[PDB]
Amino acid sequence: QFMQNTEALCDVKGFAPFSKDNGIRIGSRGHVFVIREPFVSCSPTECRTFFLTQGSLLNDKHSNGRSPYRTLMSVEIGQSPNVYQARFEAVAWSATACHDGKKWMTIGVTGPDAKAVAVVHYGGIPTDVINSWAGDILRTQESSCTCILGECYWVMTDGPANRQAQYRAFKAKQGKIIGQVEISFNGGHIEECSCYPNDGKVECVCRDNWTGTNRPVLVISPDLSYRVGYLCAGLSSDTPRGEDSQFTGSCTSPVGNQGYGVKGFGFRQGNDVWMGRTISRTSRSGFEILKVRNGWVQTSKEQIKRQVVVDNLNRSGYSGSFTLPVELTKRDCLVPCFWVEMIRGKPAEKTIWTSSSSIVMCGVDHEVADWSWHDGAILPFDID
Amino acid sequence: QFMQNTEALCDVKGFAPFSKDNGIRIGSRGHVFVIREPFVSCSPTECRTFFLTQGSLLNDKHSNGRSPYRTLMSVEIGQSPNVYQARFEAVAWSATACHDGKKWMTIGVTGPDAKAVAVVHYGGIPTDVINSWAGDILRTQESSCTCILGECYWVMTDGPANRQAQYRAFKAKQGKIIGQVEISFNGGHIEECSCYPNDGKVECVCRDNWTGTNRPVLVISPDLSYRVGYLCAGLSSDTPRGEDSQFTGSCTSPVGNQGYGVKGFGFRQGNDVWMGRTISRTSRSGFEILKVRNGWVQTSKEQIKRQVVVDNLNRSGYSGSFTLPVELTKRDCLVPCFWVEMIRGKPAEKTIWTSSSSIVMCGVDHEVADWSWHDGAILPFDID
Amino acid sequence: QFMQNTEALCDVKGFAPFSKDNGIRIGSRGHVFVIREPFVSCSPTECRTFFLTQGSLLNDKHSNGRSPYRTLMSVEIGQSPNVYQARFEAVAWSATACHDGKKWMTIGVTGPDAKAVAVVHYGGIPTDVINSWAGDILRTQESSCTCILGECYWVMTDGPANRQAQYRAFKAKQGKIIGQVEISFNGGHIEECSCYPNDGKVECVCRDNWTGTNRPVLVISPDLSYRVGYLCAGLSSDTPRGEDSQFTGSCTSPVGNQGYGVKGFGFRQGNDVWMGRTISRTSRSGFEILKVRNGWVQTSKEQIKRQVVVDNLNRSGYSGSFTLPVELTKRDCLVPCFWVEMIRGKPAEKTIWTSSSSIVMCGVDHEVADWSWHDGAILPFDID
Amino acid sequence: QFMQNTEALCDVKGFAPFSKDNGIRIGSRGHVFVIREPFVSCSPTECRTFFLTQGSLLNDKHSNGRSPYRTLMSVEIGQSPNVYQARFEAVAWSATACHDGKKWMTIGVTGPDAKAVAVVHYGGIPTDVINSWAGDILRTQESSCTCILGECYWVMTDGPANRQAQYRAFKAKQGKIIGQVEISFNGGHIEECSCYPNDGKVECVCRDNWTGTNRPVLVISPDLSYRVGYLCAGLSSDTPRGEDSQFTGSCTSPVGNQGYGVKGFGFRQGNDVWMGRTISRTSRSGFEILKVRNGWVQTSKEQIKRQVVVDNLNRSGYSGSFTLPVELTKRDCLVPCFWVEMIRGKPAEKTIWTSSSSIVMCGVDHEVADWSWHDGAILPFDID
Ligand SMILES: *[C@@H]1O[C@H](CO[C@@H]2O[C@@H](C)[C@@H](O)[C@@H](O)[C@@H]2O)[C@@H](O)[C@H](O)[C@H]1NC(C)=O
Ligand SMILES: *[C@@H]1O[C@H](CO[C@@H]2O[C@@H](C)[C@@H](O)[C@@H](O)[C@@H]2O)[C@@H](O)[C@H](O)[C@H]1NC(C)=O
Ligand SMILES: *[C@@H]1O[C@H](CO[C@@H]2O[C@@H](C)[C@@H](O)[C@@H](O)[C@@H]2O)[C@@H](O)[C@H](O)[C@H]1NC(C)=O
Ligand SMILES: *[C@@H]1O[C@H](CO[C@@H]2O[C@@H](C)[C@@H](O)[C@@H](O)[C@@H]2O)[C@@H](O)[C@H](O)[C@H]1NC(C)=O
Ligand SMILES: CCC(CC)O[C@@H]1C=C(C(=O)O)C[C@H](N)[C@H]1NC(C)=O
Ligand SMILES: CCC(CC)O[C@@H]1C=C(C(=O)O)C[C@H](N)[C@H]1NC(C)=O
Ligand SMILES: CCC(CC)O[C@@H]1C=C(C(=O)O)C[C@H](N)[C@H]1NC(C)=O
Ligand SMILES: CCC(CC)O[C@@H]1C=C(C(=O)O)C[C@H](N)[C@H]1NC(C)=O
Ligand SMILES: [Ca+2]
Ligand SMILES: [Ca+2]
Ligand SMILES: [Ca+2]
Ligand SMILES: [Ca+2]
Known part of the structure; x- marks a missing residue:
């Protein structure tokens, strides 16, 4: 049996700890x-x-x-x-x-x-390939892809990491590529999309590594029509970014004129949005999640919830989205969850190596208190 | 298929070794x-x-x-x-x-x-949450919960560890909280309940960390009516406790006027009771199990069985109850079992760390000889 | 489905290597x-x-x-x-x-x-107990028990390790003891029986630790009638033992007047027998298997096959029997297999510890060459 | 259900990375x-x-x-x-x-x-044996055997490693040898066959360790009729070998007059062939795969594809073939795959030990770029 994953995403009031490795x-x-x-x-x-x-x-x-x-x-x-x-x-x-x-x-x-070569595997064997089409580090989401009604969808980029590149969405069934589309996004930049199913569409919130401090949003339909723009909210969720008080949102265009970025995520909640971000504006430190009223559709700055997951004295890193399927939850909606990567080691810390650990949180119907489930390793290690 | 767990607990004459890790x-x-x-x-x-x-x-x-x-x-x-x-x-x-x-x-x-936040998981995903209702270390049994007819029951405490606190029982189906009750126990204190199913009810034997050297008993019905009091027997089973010869039992009230405590357990055997306790009265050392005639219903001191599991030269720790389901045993009754935690390390021992190991025993129809299945580690360790 | 294990044991011409850990x-x-x-x-x-x-x-x-x-x-x-x-x-x-x-x-x-207490477990939980009946190290086979038609059978000893003791056979169904028999064997001694199913009976070949250099044989019927004696063959298979040229067999009585012993095995092959033994007569070194014509029924010295498995420069130890069930083999007979334990360490070797490894061989329809699949560890170890 | 494996091998244009351990x-x-x-x-x-x-x-x-x-x-x-x-x-x-x-x-x-003794196991138990028939290191493929319609086939050698030896193919059903054939190959030498199913036959490409720099080919039918010769292609794929410009192919006879060799493989692609070889001619270094037009049937030197998998500064070793079954792929043909062994340690490197790691590639419908997925270990190790 294929998972339908055609349901609405659940509207949630807070996020509870699922795991810590x-x-x-x-x-x-x-x-x-x-x-x-x-x-x-x-x-x-x-x-x-x-x-x-x-x-x-x-x-x-x-x-x-x-x-x-x-x-x-x-x-x-x-x-x-x-x-x-x-x-x-x-x-x-x-x-x-x-x-x-x-x-x-x-x-x-x-x-x-x-x-580069992307190998598609399905049930533990290789089943198709996508070769680089622009000759510059073919690359993909580093998070969950999204399957609806037995077809699975993902986003890739090929091209420069710091100027205009090229972006495609792909659809597969049983490990065979059956469709693809080039995403027209002149002036925009898409990397490391964090995607989830909602109401029979794939919603992705990505990373602009060129000029934007706000995040791209891409909504793909099963037939590979799509809409693309930026997350409307009048709060910036990339890092690096500027102060919220100097920020004005845009639904259409990159704002903030800064390079670099970090993989992150958001979730649509009707017209509102949950957005994650590092607590620091300049470095990958801390992690908070904010709910913004009308933040999916307008340049709102109306924060209605905030939860801290890693405090600002501790390292964070990438974050991403996935959903719980109804065959596990027996709910009428898809439960939204996220993970946070907590990077340790060089160059910030004096070690010969770099690695990370993780924490995972899932959406629930009650607010949850702030805390910090940080990495907690004691560096340097013996090898250093 | 849901487990009924509506059967009587088996009446047992001794306990045999199940495992040692x-x-x-x-x-x-x-x-x-x-x-x-x-x-x-x-x-x-x-x-x-x-x-x-x-x-x-x-x-x-x-x-x-x-x-x-x-x-x-x-x-x-x-x-x-x-x-x-x-x-x-x-x-x-x-x-x-x-x-x-x-x-x-x-x-x-x-x-x-x-x-604090308590996350309920069911089949390996989060499914509900209970937030602290009194703002002082929300906490729970540290042993098995109890499921009857597809509904599962447990006890939590929120409040001071050494004076009056608040106590609630909860019922869930498939990982969703469907009921709760506040347990009225003015003057009493409940922590770390050791619970088991017996005759379609949940019987728990707990820890009084305020003034009692005897243990609380809580019997919960499927509709969340309950009875609460203290284990009647005229032998004290907490630690610390006083000498048995200075002890008089009570079915209703804490006796012995001493603080602190240790998680333990007992099992009803019609009107009799099996009760565990550390052999030492002052420290978590040794472990013995005693059967007391009419000890569930009266302040009896009539000991009819005793078995030692850890001798008094060796460390013990927490202990707790669970039952074997009839789908494993094919019996007409639920077999009672317990575990004992054997704590090693600081502050009693000169090490930088603290941990424990365990031994598990199950009820059988013959008496079993005394022995000591102690931890046996040799401290300090290399790291110390 | 219960395994019948009512078939004849296969008649085999040699043994092939199954495993080495x-x-x-x-x-x-x-x-x-x-x-x-x-x-x-x-x-x-x-x-x-x-x-x-x-x-x-x-x-x-x-x-x-x-x-x-x-x-x-x-x-x-x-x-x-x-x-x-x-x-x-x-x-x-x-x-x-x-x-x-x-x-x-x-x-x-x-x-x-x-x-001592013997705990019977069935499907990973305890299900019955046998307490010591003679107060002197209740003990059992250290090899496979034998199940026929859903009932399983084993042998235990209680009493002295070096003079007359007491011996019982037990029968269980689904982990419950449903029968037992005391084995009358005045003058004989039974330890560490190696048993297998053959033609709807349990055949065991054991260790006499009192006076015999030959091995006891016990054949138990499903109703717990039995016959007991010694393996007839005019070659001795215990260790220690005397030279074959000073040995005369007996079907009834211990021969050789020497103490001590080692767990071993044999298999009936119609009227013939496969018997294992250490190559050394004085120490647990080497391992050979000999087939003796009419060796099950007469004091024959007629060797018809010999295979070496561990050479005489290398340590051996215990050995034992088991069979392959027909649901794995699809044969019309039960395939006979044995294992050999290869002990390393103290007191023979200068180490603080003692342990063993194993090799397993199964009966096949062709002769197999001699070799040595010895332990191969290099002592002492770092800890020594 | 038995796997048919009667389908044609897929015709493939390049090979994608499956795994790296x-x-x-x-x-x-x-x-x-x-x-x-x-x-x-x-x-x-x-x-x-x-x-x-x-x-x-x-x-x-x-x-x-x-x-x-x-x-x-x-x-x-x-x-x-x-x-x-x-x-x-x-x-x-x-x-x-x-x-x-x-x-x-x-x-x-x-x-x-x-x-020597070869033990056949089927479903994790021994089920038959083949003893050495020529008394000189009985030996086999060191790669996958081939099963068609529930019968499985393999090749063995017994005899000298550097002059004429003897070669047999065997067929088994459910772990029982039901047929065998001696392969007449006077003047030829077969070792370490790399075999796969194609069109209801077993095709093997082997190693000549006597005089050939080209590889033997053996095609076995289910009834154990066979054809044997050498891979026709006018490019040599053993190591050691001579320069391609001094090489002329042969369908019938060993060419190049050099000893020694390395296990390798090839795949028929209608009348064409994919052949693997080390990049070095003198040592086991590098690994490339070449497609040669009409290379299965003629002494062609017409290379139509080449892919590098390990570059020539890095160690390689053995390579071998297997196929993906249609019950995993849902294709109408058997997908061809190969592995490459990358040997590290003595005598080439200054270590006390020798071991290897691997990379696995599978046939796909697009060309894949050259790269090097070499071992990457840093020698010597601590033990050295
Ligand atoms: C870690 O590596 C350091 C740098 O080594 C050099 O750069 C690398 C990429 C290799 O090419 C290596 O051959 C070079 O030597 C070392 O200088 C240092 O020893 C290393 N540290 C430890 C603790 O292993
Ligand atoms: C164990 O830790 C001891 C105490 O260290 C101090 O307290 C802890 C909680 C941390 O805040 C740490 O930063 C402080 O340094 C040490 O003094 C001692 O070295 C440790 N022992 C070993 C053997 O690792
Ligand atoms: C191994 O143990 C030796 C004997 O130790 C003594 O006997 C044992 C049974 C214990 O009671 C222990 O308390 C006694 O100290 C030691 O003398 C020796 O150090 C040990 N060797 C190593 C390498 O750990
Ligand atoms: C590895 O082994 C070297 C050679 O040892 C000799 O040859 C082997 C086959 C055995 O028979 C052994 O008894 C002989 O001593 C050693 O000389 C060397 O120490 C070893 N190296 C290390 C690092 O373990
Ligand atoms: C190559 C551009 C890419 C996206 C911005 O850089 C990523 C950024 C990284 C980062 O910002 O932490 C590390 C990633 N592992 C790297 N991705 C790849 C494939 O190298
Ligand atoms: C906080 C009160 C609680 C019950 C008395 O103390 C417990 C006692 C402990 C103990 O007495 O060994 C250790 C427990 N891990 C601790 N529980 C928690 C949640 O911290
Ligand atoms: C106690 C008598 C018994 C049988 C002879 O001694 C055995 C001999 C042993 C031996 O001869 O190697 C080691 C066994 N582990 C021991 N069995 C037990 C339970 O201690
Ligand atoms: C014995 C001849 C055989 C085939 C040429 O030599 C092989 C060559 C080897 C090699 O060339 O790397 C190593 C093999 N493990 C060895 N096979 C066996 C069984 O020893
Ligand atoms: Ca950016
Ligand atoms: Ca107390
Ligand atoms: Ca003896
Ligand atoms: Ca060669």
Whole structure:
């Protein structure tokens, strides 16, 4: 049976802690991959954490830091990314994964920068390929893809990381690419889309790495018509970004004139929006989630909820979205969840290596207090 | 199929050894979580050990000792709480878990002391939340919850650990809270209830951490009517406690005028009772189980059985109750079992860390000899 | 479905290598239990290796050598007895296990020498108990028990290890003891029986630790009538033993006037017999298997086959029997298999610890060449 | 259900990366077997990596280098050959394995050089044996065997490694040998065949270790009629070999007059051929795959595709073939895949040990760019 995933996303008032893997703490002694770019995706029976290894273990000389050793692997949600619980998925230095109700689809991108290859896998074997079409680091979401009615959808970019690039959406059935579309977005920039199903469409909130401090939004229909623009809200959710009091929103255009960025996410809540962001404006530190009234449709600054998940003295990193399927929840709507990556090590910290751990939160019908579920590893390590 | 668990508890004459995990011994070299608060709960197909990790491994610098790293995880009964066999359950510094016949329900409490959040999980995803209602360390059983006819029941406390607090019982179906009751117990104190099903009711034997050296008893009906009082028996089963020869029982009121306490358990046996206690009156050392004639209904001192499980030269700790379901036993009654936690390390011992291991015993129809299945680890460890 | 196991044992011409776990070699670096007394038993879907741990790991200070830490655990056949693949079965310093077609039955004996308790487990929970009836180390086979038509059978001893003791056979269904018999064997001694099904009976070949250099044989019928005596063959198969040229067989009585012994096995082959023995007469070194014409029924010295499995420069240890069920083989007969335990460490070798590894061989229809699949570990280890 | 595997092999234009296990990198710290001779084979539900351990772990003193410790084990494709994920298959210093749709068949050869024994296992138990028929290292493919319509086929050699030997093909059903044929190949030499199903036949491409720099080809029909010769193509694919510009092909006879060799593979593509080879002509370094027009039927030098997988500065080793079954792909043809073994350590490198890791590629309908997915371990290791 294919998962329909045609339901509305649930409207939620707060987010509760789902899991914490403690991967780095455990890796001081246990056998745990150096990783980065973790993400969560669910099947009808379980949620799993996916991650890009460096082909090396914490506290080993090989952790010394797009290589040909990076692989996509997965564990059950809340397990550390440890060697002896890991399932191999793909050769990959960029990836996305999702389940259609019947099997896991994973996409791993590997190969040379000038001519990369994305291998689509379905049920644990390779089934199709997409080669780079613009010759400049073909790359993808680093979070869950989205499956509706047995067809799965994802976004890729090829081109410069800091100026205009090219963006395509793809649709597959049972691991075969059956459609694609080029997304026209002159002046805009899309990287590392965080996508989820809502009302029979794929809604993605992405990263502008060129000039925008606000985030791109892309809404794809099953026939690959789409709409694209920027998240309307009058609060900026990229990093780096400027102060909220100097920010004016835009539904159409990049605002803030700053480079760089970080993968993040948001969720539509009718006309409102939940948006995540690092607490710091200049560095990947802290993590808060804000609900903004009419923030999906207008340049609103009307904050109605805020929750802190990692405090501002502690490192954060990427964040991303996924949903709980109704075959697990028995709800009439899709429950929205997110993860946060907490990066440790170089160059900010004096270590030879870099890795991350994660925390996962899911939408519930009550507000939840602020706290900090930070990484908690004690650096440097023995190897340093 | 839901488990009925409407049967009488079996009347048993002695307890036989079920498992011993040797977690600390194995942790001198293997990759094993620092834990405390282990417990056992069964499904129709297996028994599992649940435990609260410290987000760190034995013999690692992170084991140096309510943190945001503590997690609830589980293994099959008698496996050490090791990294590579562990199943992740919840973010938690207090917990309870049980199976309804179809899936595992777990509850993990995390967050700040002033405003904690308990996340209910069902079949490995979050499904409901209970926030602190009194603002002072919302907390729960640290042992098995109890499911009857597809509805599961547990006890929580919010308030002071050493004076009057507030106590509630909750009922859920498929991970959704469908009822709750405040337990009126003015002058009494309830913590860390050890509960089991008997004759279509939930019977719990708890810890009074305020003034009582005797244990509270709470009997909850499926409609959330209840009765509450103290275990009648004229022998005290908390620690610390006074000498038995200075003790007089009470069915209604705390006796002994001493603070502090330890999680323990008892089982009704018609009108008699099996009660566990540490052998020492002043410290968590040794473990014995006593059967007292009419001890459930009267202030009896008539001991009819005694069995030692850990001798008085060796550390003990918490203990708790669970039952074997009839779909495993094919009996006409629910078999009563208990576990004992054996704590090692600081402050009693000169180590930087604290953890525990466990032994599990089940009720049988013959008396079993005394012995000592103690922890057996050799301290200090390399890290110390 | 219960396994019938009513078929004749296959008549076999040689034995082929099934598995080798390399447990000690791997334990120089990996996380592997110190063990002894390994054995193999099969279900309709797989063969497993069972073993008695010391509650400690190789190369750790706890391996420094009937304790309360010993446990029965199991892995798939040919896996090292490593922590992260092990299934917990029982608290045990002596054990037996077997499958009835539906579930695993295990028996673990633990407790004090004067008053030990054997806990019967069935499908991973305790289900019955046998307490010591003579007050002197209740003990059992250390190899597979035998199930026929859904009823399982095993042998136990209680009493002195070096003079007359007492011996009982037990029958269980679904983990409940439904029958027992005392085996009258005045002047004889039975320990550590190696049993298998043949033609709807249980045939066991045991160890005489009192005066015999020949092995006891016990044949039990489903109704617990039995016959008992000694393996007829005019070659001695215990260790220690005398030279074959000074040996005369007996069907009825212990021969050779020597103490001590080692667990071993034999298989009836119509009127012939396969018998295992250490190659050395004085120490547990080497391992050979001999087929003797009419050796089951007469004091024959007519050797018709010989195969070496461990050469005489290498350590051996216990050996034992099990059979392959027809639901795995699709044969019309039960295939006979054996294992050999290869003990390493103290007192023979200069180490602080003692453990073993294993090799498993199964009966085939062709002769197989001699070789040596010895342990191969390099002692002492780092810990020594 | 038996797998038919009667379909044509798919005609493919390039090969995409399936997996990379990073076994040596991970083994610098993790618990990973010293191996060599890895290979991949698939069932209807998954692909697995098989490998011959040395009965020892990387970075341990036992890794110090046909022993009686070598075993055949397997993991899921892309897992390192680590202790705690490994499934035991056979005692083996040479091996082959394949699935018939219902169960795994494995063959492990062990024993003395003069009189080796090959044990056939089926569904995880031994089921038949083949003893050496020529008394000189009985040996087999070190890659996948081939199953068609429920019958499985493989090739073995017995005799000298460097002059004329003897070669047989065998057929089994459910682990029982039901047929065999001696392959007449006077003047030729066959070792380490790489076989796959194509159009209801078994096509194998092998290693000539006597005089040929070209590879033998053997095509076996289900009734054990066969044809044998050499791969026609006018490019040599063994190592060592001469320059392509001095090479003329032959369909019938060994060409190049050089000894030694390396296990490799090729795939028929109608009348064309994909052939793998090391990039170096003198050493096992680099790996490229070439498609040659009419290379199956004529001495063609017409190269139409080339892809590099390991560059020529990096070590390679053995390579081999397998196919994806239609029950995984839902295609109308069998997808061709190969693996490459990347050997590290002595004598080329200054270490006490030798092991390998692997990369796996599968046939797709687009060309894929050149890259290098080399081993990447940093030698020497701590133990050296
Ligand atoms: C980590 O690596 C440092 C840099 O080494 C150099 O750069 C790398 C990329 C390689 O090409 C290597 O060959 C070069 O030597 C070292 O200088 C340093 O020793 C390393 N540190 C530790 C603790 O292993
Ligand atoms: C264990 O920790 C001891 C105390 O350290 C101090 O307190 C903790 C809570 C942290 O805030 C830390 O920053 C402080 O330094 C140490 O003094 C001691 O080194 C540690 N021992 C070992 C063996 O790791
Ligand atoms: C192994 O143990 C040796 C003997 O120790 C003594 O006997 C044991 C049974 C215990 O009671 C212990 O308390 C006694 O100290 C030691 O002398 C020796 O250090 C140990 N060796 C190693 C390498 O750990
Ligand atoms: C590795 O082994 C070297 C050679 O040792 C000798 O040869 C082997 C086959 C055995 O017979 C052994 O008994 C002999 O001693 C050693 O000389 C060397 O120490 C070893 N190296 C390390 C680092 O373990
Ligand atoms: C190459 C552009 C890309 C998106 C901005 O840079 C990413 C940014 C990163 C970052 O900002 O942390 C690390 C990513 N692993 C990297 N992606 C790849 C494929 O290299
Ligand atoms: C906070 C009061 C509570 C019950 C008395 O104290 C417990 C006692 C403990 C103890 O007495 O050993 C340790 C428990 N982990 C702690 N519980 C929590 C949630 O912190
Ligand atoms: C206690 C008598 C018994 C049988 C002879 O001794 C056995 C001999 C042993 C041996 O000879 O190797 C080791 C066994 N683990 C031991 N059994 C127990 C339960 O201790
Ligand atoms: C014995 C001849 C054989 C085929 C040429 O040599 C092989 C070559 C090898 C090699 O060339 O790398 C290593 C193999 N493990 C070895 N096979 C066996 C069974 O020893
Ligand atoms: Ca930006
Ligand atoms: Ca108290
Ligand atoms: Ca004897
Ligand atoms: Ca050659």
